Each structure stands twice: as structure tokens, then as C-alpha cells.
Design a protein around this ligand. Structure first.
Ligand SMILES: C#Cc1nc(CNC(=O)c2cc[nH]n2)cs1
Ligand SMILES: [Zn+2]
Ligand SMILES: [Zn+2]
Ligand SMILES: [Zn+2]
Length: 426
């Protein structure tokens, strides 16, 4: 954890707090703010481990409280006393975070009012939820009880929040000049939430775009495992069928250097090319480069795919608990590991078409241990009646396919791809 005796640089606070000592520790800062929880403030490394909990927060002077959720509240939304503002803050954080994290991390660009305003809606102390086993994130003065984000309805204080001041990381210039170096999507409309949004965006850029640590693991919070297994199932299905239908002599597999053949029994000449996940801008196809056979780009984000490609590309616009808002239109996809992904661009696919759903199988029609569909490509459907085994497998594959799509992945293929060509493999 971050030692409370660590020095805190106070130059960013001195316009809101004139006269503040240059020599300052976290210990003295927390005291001046009026306050298993050794420090309210955390290290960059702890913050990165808890990116799902990040909420940018800015206060502008009555005071306008702005959050990276887009919300502005005025404490005296129009101005209201702190005793009702705090209730809204609890509800807002609880609904934003209950399916993401066991805590909140306020990401600051600290100039003073934000820190001195915390005592009006934060309480600290040593706890678990009164109604479950999750750690407590809220407190209620009405009942003198504690709750997690799931059981906090009607609570009035944030309990043991964490926080980090981006201005401690060693920047020159103000927030907007640093944020705008990397991102054109978030403006500065001069409301507190705009600053809150830029602050979080800059932190995401510093910690996941220019710096990358794929060794950090993140807890399971949703359908991660089913999604990942579906992606492997779809990858095998689509590539196997492409090879059967068009009989490419060579396949160029471009992407993760730890990739394995997804169709190990295919006859094709399989050649690998190493490219790590690009976290900043999509790769330029000119630099990466292939006109023989087919190219496979499985989550290898390029600016324009060649016409002879099979592509899986994550759609950064998808709304889900796994996909967090990112930098310059990118998104931070957190599924076991954290992957910042450049903004989705439909123009990357101009040479391709959307891959249609289909299910293909050459396995024997046998049930161990009634489906009608034009897209069940099997011997039994060719012959007029889908067998029970392929019926079961088709419905499982459909489920997997829909899971992958709903998670944000999109699939694209060379324009000549035609499932009609699979029927003659039977
Ligand atoms: C009541 C009331 C108040 N409204 C504001 C407006 N906020 C800003 O102009 C701003 C500047 C930078 N970021 N936001 C401050 S106090
Ligand atoms: Zn609970
Ligand atoms: Zn931004
Ligand atoms: Zn069958």
C-alpha cells in the first residue's frame, strides 16, 4: 500500500488553498481534509489493479461536483444541500459500480475543492455488508449500518473510498493540454463532469495505452469464461469452413505471437506473423505487410484489411460490464486481462463483408448418452432431416455465436465466401 508518510506535491492545490505547505505528506493531507484501510490514497499499481472502480471526480467553485459518469450536482442538477447531494452520490456510484467492482477509486486532477468536499459525503473507518459478505462501500446514518454497492438503497455516505491524484505523476501544464495530446473525443464544455471525464481518460491513457501490463489478472465479474470459450468455438468453425469452401493453399495468421493453429487438421500451409495487441492506433497494413491464400486477423486491429481476409474485430461501442470507456474513442476491454482497443472504424472493412451466421459439421450423425434451419450445414440436413446430435450441436453453437456477438465482437470475411460451397464437402 501507499505509505501515509509519502510526500504529496501541493503546487496544484495552492490556488484553491493559498498558503498550503510545500512539504506535505498524505498523513497531513488526510488530516487537513478533515478525516485494513491504511490510506485513502493508493499507488498507481493498486489503481491499475482496480481500474473497474475508477470514477473521475472534479469539483468547481456553491460547488459543482462532476463525475466521469457525466453527472453534475450543485451543492449549496440545480443546487441542493449536502444532506441530499450525498444520497444522490451513493445511489449514482452504487448503480454504476455494483456489477463492476468491490470499491470506488476517485481519479482526480486535484486542485483543492474536490479534496475538501469529501468530508461532506465520505466516512472512513476500519467492514462487511450488513446483508451479504461483500466488503462495505456505503454507510447509513439513519440505521447505523453498512452496505456493499448491491444493498445500499437509501444510504447516505460513501464508506472507505479510495482515490488517486493524477497530478502526482509528473505532468507539465494543465489537465486539458495533457488530455488533448492524446484524445479528441472529450471536449471541455466548462462543466465539472467534463474535467472528471478528461481526468479518467488521461489516467487510462497513461496506464493502459502508453504503458501495458498483460500480466495483471482481473476477477471474474460476468460471462468472461463463456465468452472466451465461444470465441474459440467460432474461430475454429469459421476458419475450418473458409478453408473447406475455398481451398486456400496458404493461410497467413497475423496477430498474437502465442497463437496456435485454430484448425489443426487442415491441410493448408499455416504461417504465423507476430503482432501484439495494438493499444493506441490501429496497425497500418503497409507496415505489417500475403496476396496468396487467405489472411486471418483474429483481434489484430488494422486500419484497412486486405480483400483476402477473415477478421474478428472488437466493437468498442458495445455496452457491457466488461467494456469500460477508453481513450480517443477506444475502449478498455477487461476480460481476465485489460486490453485497450482503438476505436471501431467501419472503414477498416471496406474490402470485406459481414460474415453470415452458419453452422457446419462433418461429424457423424450419431447421438450418444426438431430442428429446421437453412444454416445447419450437415449431411443430415442435406438429406432432408437434421439428426438429433447435429440439432443439439447447432443450438449450442448458435448460443455461443450470439454470446460472442453480444459481447462486442464482429466478424468479417472476403466477399467470395459462400456457404453454398460447403454442401459439396458431403
Ligand atoms: C452553482 C454553481 C457552479 N457552476 C460552475 C460551472 N463549472 C465550470 O465552469 C467549470 C470550469 C472547469 N470545469 N467546470 C462552478 S460552480
Ligand atoms: Zn451486500
Ligand atoms: Zn479523452
Ligand atoms: Zn446429423
Amino acid at each position: 500500500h501507499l505509505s501515509v508518510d509519502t510526500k504529496f506535491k501541493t503546487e496544484g492545490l495552492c490556488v484553491d488553498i493559498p498558503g498550503i505547505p510545500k512539504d506535505m505528506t498524505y498523513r497531513r493531507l488526510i488530516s487537513m481534509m478533515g478525516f485494513g484501510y491504511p490510506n485513502m490514497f493508493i499507488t498507481r499499481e493498486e489503481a491499475i489493479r482496480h481500474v473497474r472502480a475508477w470514477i473521475g471526480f472534479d469539483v468547481e467553485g456553491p460547488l459543482q461536483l462532476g463525475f466521469s459518469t457525466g453527472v453534475n450536482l450543485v451543492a449549496v442538477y440545480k443546487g441542493l444541500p449536502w444532506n441530499v447531494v450525498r444520497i444522490k452520490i451513493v445511489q449514482m456510484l452504487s448503480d454504476t459500480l455494483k456489477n463492476l467492482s468491490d470499491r470506488v477509486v476517485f481519479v482526480l486532477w486535484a486542485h483543492g475543492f474536490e479534496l475538501t468536499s469529501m468530508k461532506y459525503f465520505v466516512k472512513i473507518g476500519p467492514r462487511t455488508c450488513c446483508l451479504c459478505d461483500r466488503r462495505a462501500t456505503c454507510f447509513s446514518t439513519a440505521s447505523d449500518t453498512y452496505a456493499c454497492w448491491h444493498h445500499s438503497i437509501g444510504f447516505d455516505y460513501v464508506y472507505n473510498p479510495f482515490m488517486i491524484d493524477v497530478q502526482q505523476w509528473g505532468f507539465t501544464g494543465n489537465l486539458q493540454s495533457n488530455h488533448d495530446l492524446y484524445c479528441q473525443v472529450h471536449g471541455n464544455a466548462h462543466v465539472a463532469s467534463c474535467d472528471a471525464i478528461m481526468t479518467r481518460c488521461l489516467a487510462v491513457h497513461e496506464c493502459f495505452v502508453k504503458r501495458v501490463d498483460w500480466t495483471i489478472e482481473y476477477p471474474i465479474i460476468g460471462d468472461e469464461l463463456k465468452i472466451n470459450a465461444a470465441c474459440r468455438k467460432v474461430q475454429h468453425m469459421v476458419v475450418k469452413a473458409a478453408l473447406l469452401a475455398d481451398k486456400f493453399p496458404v493461410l497467413h495468421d497475423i496477430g498474437n505471437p502465442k497463437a496456435i493453429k485454430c484448425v489443426p487438421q487442415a491441410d493448408v500451409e499455416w504461417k504465423f506473423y507476430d503482432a501484439q495487441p495494438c493499444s493506441d492506433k490501429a496497425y497500418k497494413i503497409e507496415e505489417l505487410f500475403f496476396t496468396d491464400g487467405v489472411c486471418l486477423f483474429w483481434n489484430c486491429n488494422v486500419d484497412r484489411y486486405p480483400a483476402n481476409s477473415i477478421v474478428c474485430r472488437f466493437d468498442t461501442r458495445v455496452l457491457s460490464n466488461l467494456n469500460l470507456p477508453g481513450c480517443d474513442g477506444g475502449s478498455l476491454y477487461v476480460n481476465k486481462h485489460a486490453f485497450h482497443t482503438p476505436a471501431f472504424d467501419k472503414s477498416a472493412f471496406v474490402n470485406l463483408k459481414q460474415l453470415p451466421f452458419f453452422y457446419y459439421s462433418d461429424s457423424p450423425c450419431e447421438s450418444h448418452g426438431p430442428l429446421k434451419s437453412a444454416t445447419c450445414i450437415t449431411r443430415c440436413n442435406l438429406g432432408g432431416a437434421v439428426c438429433r446430435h447435429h440439432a443439439n450441436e447447432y443450438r449450442l453453437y448458435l448460443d455461443a455465436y450470439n454470446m460472442m456477438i453480444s459481447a462486442g465482437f464482429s466478424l468479417w470475411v472476403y466477399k467470395q465466401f459462400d456457404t453454398y460451397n460447403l454442401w459439396n464437402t458431403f
